[PDB]
């Protein structure tokens, strides 16, 4: 049907935008500077970022671990108001990471993306409210884009105050700021200036005192005020465009809100506005008009790099400016070149930073294509400008019914962040103001003509109208059918009739988002469960060859396609040379590359063998250590058109998404294993290499001038022999491609250890061996434990090797090690319907109940389903699958199989089965009696049972966080600094923390020594620790503990704070009072 | 907001409902049928005397009038035009055919009233050389508020000067 516009452009667009202009306009707005005395102009033709060009392949920049960027010149102009003379130059000022294929950026060689967030929009708003009785004040409030605010209200007088921040101010003269005659807001309001008139105290004191003491006796107190004062005060605060952006929006709303008339770019405000407000406030004291609800998606706005950036740049400037302001100005009239008077830096920071950190330069994560998408078109509420988790609570997390269509409600982390992080509906997108125009369909006489290329309007939910939910039994040829078609309307649903209706949704699955509108039979499940679903889907590792599932929602080919994890017919051509690393159908020069000569790009390699030499890349690490690669996939000599797709990303398959596989499942209660939240598995499962994935691995290490010296990298190290000085290069590195194991050496380096501190007993033991011992710690690098796996690579980094290292390091070495992994007991692994499950036993294949045809089934989940999960949806499709599994044919589908009085999905599926018999007559393919139930024997001995069990194929999926990702142990190890208690943090020998509630399970029990000791000897009596340890090594018990540390610490503090702690004993018959350490 | 008269029923009537701007001076009154867009409200709004009508451009938005008395079509002819951005920016010097030169106190196309600034004349005459005393004899202009700036310089053949040098500086009695 429709056309899915590109679904990430969201941020393609933005950037381009900016780029295309989004900063010129700022820029040259900031172009005009000039001496401190108007006498020496410093303006520039800010209308060209004249940017020379990126230096690196992307690839490079990865390899160089550098920030793909650009850099960027501004021609400037003829300077000075003393003798008007140019000393013209241009300048670049900074490097700009000019985006990437995935519409994101990479920097420092890593890979990141900038989320886009969502905030309220400048303009004005009113909130009224009650007392404890019903005194129903109002308020008002203003927000620039940037700059302070202006607050108003009505405090049981009906008489009012121009508060500025929260309640900073409060003046009866709410509208007597910079206006004489008074009538301008006494009669020009033609309403109720202070309910018709005047405050009580409508005193009109504002002659020479105008803009004086108002901004002093109850502002900003404590100075001999000065009518200037007050003035130069306000006018700052609202007039230097310097600091008050309304925001195009700003206007744009206003006016709209108040059909003010001020178009005018009037990027900052007026008076007439102000009052205009105030009226409105009044008018509704009298109640003529509406308070405003910010929750309404419409009056709330989302913004992306384009400006996030941009403005952040602006501040870059200002800072810069100053520097210049003087450095340019104050000094003499010659030296001042349009060159050494400007410096990047501050910009280069600001951005270098912005990216380099915000909360928005998030890392990408490329687990798998759709984890991207959905992480680009994610949008967020938090962030600087936003909220915090705390400072915003709840009803600000809910489905304001305007989200409809615009924010998949199904979609959310949790943790606290529920609600704070939504993603984007499928079809949504945004208007240059940064509200989400929502595609729809114009139904005439309550009937969509379809022809309409949708209806890209309804940026806000208040189209206000008959709007139909894109799930309508629709008469062929337009007409709706039921005279009871619902509709939202003014945020309400409402029984409607087909005639008097306007708007239909383009589809019944738009409000949802990625991983949500994809559920095979969504329509049929709990929501939340489907929540989980989605997410799981994002976490499915990718596999050697993730197969396109069987029953899928149609909607995906695209999704893949726009990952940009695949490789797409750029243009056009009929393949020729395609080895497994590129498709020289490209730089070769024949029909591929040459209808890559049909029509022949602007600058690009317009005909020849073109750098349509796409490479294609094997096994690169991911933000999750997962590997990716795109085998040629296409044949040779054949015919492709742009947008087609050439080779496949990690886990996509026919050029379409493919997240996991599909295997035959049964539902029964296998004793113990599977008993509950447990899954069985045949052995063939991973025996066929299905479900095994890759993972690979960064390992770097580096050497560094101790002020003892260097420390190095030798082949040689003391104390070696096999797994040491064996699988080791001349610099003690490894050869590419070397098995390794769990303790062997990655790279060996030593250290200038020397001595200068030793126990006589060590000197002894020399003497006896009189070994003149060596002197060099030897921090080789060893594979830790529980790793395997070939080595892919190394990446040395020293003066010559890029020298990318901390100040004073010599070599840095990366090393990369990969790893197949089969499945194995212990792996979250779940379906597309919140089917969180863990492997428990694997059965050798010849024990599972197989099938009537003996085909051994192979998972076996628990039958009783759709409980709290309410995900009955998944049987539906199992079944289905199985149909297209026996029929051996994939089938797309869509949630909400409506236009059918009955379940529809229900008589499909049967139908298919049904007929599936007879195309093979296998018969047991389908049993109307006990639908899709089957007999089953069971391998172990050879019988079915009283109750036939359903059977289906089904698409499962295996999940990143893998057992090894969470395993730990610690006999003992490194402690803390200050507080010596073992160093528990996850990577490295950590330790289980026993918080109060945990101790509340110990002292709550009976004999609690343990408690005690646990509190100490395995965490603190320092000496206690040791010598226990010992004491067991001895072979006996352990000695009595002492007092833990952290006590002693507490002493200290407290003592360090005006105390006289006398912990102390009271001994002797003379009872003796002492004190202690 | 009260209850009904003891409460019973409340209504509509059909009889269609017009949504009638302040700028909807209507022509149609109770109990008149006119037709579907019969003629109906027409707004003969009004202004008054003032100056020119400089046709509020009919156009200048969608419609967007701007309905003026324009009035002071001041013929300052021979305001001749020597005007540029040298290491300044623009100045219809308004040299005039008499080479008077009325520089741009108001510059072009601003809008200011009440003793508004207008035009600035040059003269090197009655200007003094390098400072000095003006032991003049006999012009007339008042204290006037503005024996200062704001001058109705009445009458003078009469203004004699002692243009002087002037070098006035705190420091010790230390040097020359």
From Swiss-Prot, chain A:
Signal peptide extent: none
UniProt keyword Magnesium present: no
GO-annotated cellular components: DNA-directed RNA polymerase complex
Annotated keywords: DNA-directed RNA polymerase, Nucleotidyltransferase, Transcription, Transferase
Pfam families: RNA_pol_Rpb2_1 (PF04563), RNA_pol_Rpb2_2 (PF04561), RNA_pol_Rpb2_3 (PF04565), RNA_pol_Rpb2_45 (PF10385), RNA_pol_Rpb2_6 (PF00562), RNA_pol_Rpb2_7 (PF04560)
GO BP term (any one): DNA-templated transcription
Catalytic activity annotation: RNA(n) + a ribonucleoside 5'-triphosphate = RNA(n+1) + diphosphate
Cited InterPro entries: DNA-dir_RNA_pol_bsu_ext_1_sf (IPR042107), DNA-dir_RNA_pol_bsu_external_1 (IPR019462), DNA-dir_RNA_pol_su2 (IPR015712), DNA-dir_RNAP_su2_dom (IPR007120), DNA-dir_RNAP_su2_hyb_sf (IPR037033), RNA_pol_bsu_bac (IPR010243), RNA_pol_bsu_CS (IPR007121), RNA_pol_bsu_protrusion (IPR007644)
CDD domains with a match to the protein in the record: RNA_pol_B_RPB2
Record-listed E.C. numbers: 2.7.7.6
An example Gene Ontology molecular-function term: DNA-directed RNA polymerase activity
Physiological role: DNA-dependent RNA polymerase catalyzes the transcription of DNA into RNA using the four ribonucleoside triphosphates as substrates.
Family that this chain belongs to: Belongs to the RNA polymerase beta chain family.
Assembly mode: In cyanobacteria the RNAP catalytic core is composed of 2 alpha, 1 beta, 1 beta', 1 gamma and 1 omega subunit. When a sigma factor is associated with the core the holoenzyme is formed, which can initiate transcription.
Name listed for the protein in its UniProt record: DNA-directed RNA polymerase subunit beta
Originating species: Nostoc sp. (strain PCC 7120 / SAG 25.82 / UTEX 2576)
Curated annotation (Swiss-Prot), chain B:
Coiled coil (UniProt feature): none
Subunit structure: In cyanobacteria the RNAP catalytic core is composed of 2 alpha, 1 beta, 1 beta', 1 gamma and 1 omega subunit. When a sigma factor is associated with the core the holoenzyme is formed, which can initiate transcription.
Similarity annotation: Belongs to the RNA polymerase beta' chain family. RpoC2 subfamily.
Function of the protein: DNA-dependent RNA polymerase catalyzes the transcription of DNA into RNA using the four ribonucleoside triphosphates as substrates.
UniProt-recorded name of the protein: DNA-directed RNA polymerase subunit beta'
Protein's gene: rpoC2
